[PDB]
Design a protein around this ligand. Sequence first.
Ligand SMILES: CC(C)c1cc(Oc2c(Cl)cc(-n3nc(N)c(=O)[nH]c3=O)cc2Cl)n[nH]c1=O
Length: 247
Amino acid sequence: MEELQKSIGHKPEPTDEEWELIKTVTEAHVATNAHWKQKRKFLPEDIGQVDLEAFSHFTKIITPAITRVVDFAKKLPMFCELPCEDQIILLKGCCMEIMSLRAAVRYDPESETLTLNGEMAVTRGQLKNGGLGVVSDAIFDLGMSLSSFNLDDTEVALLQAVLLMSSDRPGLACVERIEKYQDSFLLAFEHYINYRKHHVTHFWPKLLMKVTDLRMIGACHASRFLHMKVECPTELFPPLFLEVFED
Ligand SMILES: CC(C)c1cc(Oc2c(Cl)cc(-n3nc(N)c(=O)[nH]c3=O)cc2Cl)n[nH]c1=O
């Protein structure tokens, strides 16, 4: 099947089973990702440049952000086949990974701004000084890189699923079963990329490297959260934002 075709040099497009999964993951992403470019309103220059005034803007939108990731996971059926313990662990893990990817693809190089949530358009300094620190620099840096891949909404969606189904997080019972799901995404992704016919050499390896970069953004963010908990008062943290990134 897969590895013999690879030996021949055929780049196989998706199967009828995979197209059904591709449609599901894409429609899940599209529901949970709201005409972004005109819809944005820019956060002002005096906000930023931890700035608590800047922190306050993000924490309003962060409760929506977190639920958008949970509702995406909800819309995937394989996720629903897992237990609550594993589901909670998986969300707690990939939440900021999925959040960051989405912010990175909404990067405009003329204005030099990621557009958070498809509404709050911010600069590298604003997101940095408002809370994220060096995690701002990484998401911007990613956005700059992801601009020249030109990922469609399917490619972002399948990429998000890969991050969700990550068997290596601690406390997971069904580790074997999560690997099977990730593999079926990863294989379908590889196949969709062949249907797309991108004209960047070694595209698929290069795109897998961005999965690792996203996994770094999440880990660095876990450390930023600890600094945020020290620097900012707990009154300004929403209960869910605490719940998702604590412990
Ligand atoms: C400063 C602190 C409060 C903080 C800010 C922060 O910034 C972001 C926010 Cl509030 C949202 C998203 N985001 N999330 C989604 N679900 C989505 O569809 N689109 C999207 O842009 C992305 C980023 Cl980077 N991330 N984590 C943090 O801990």
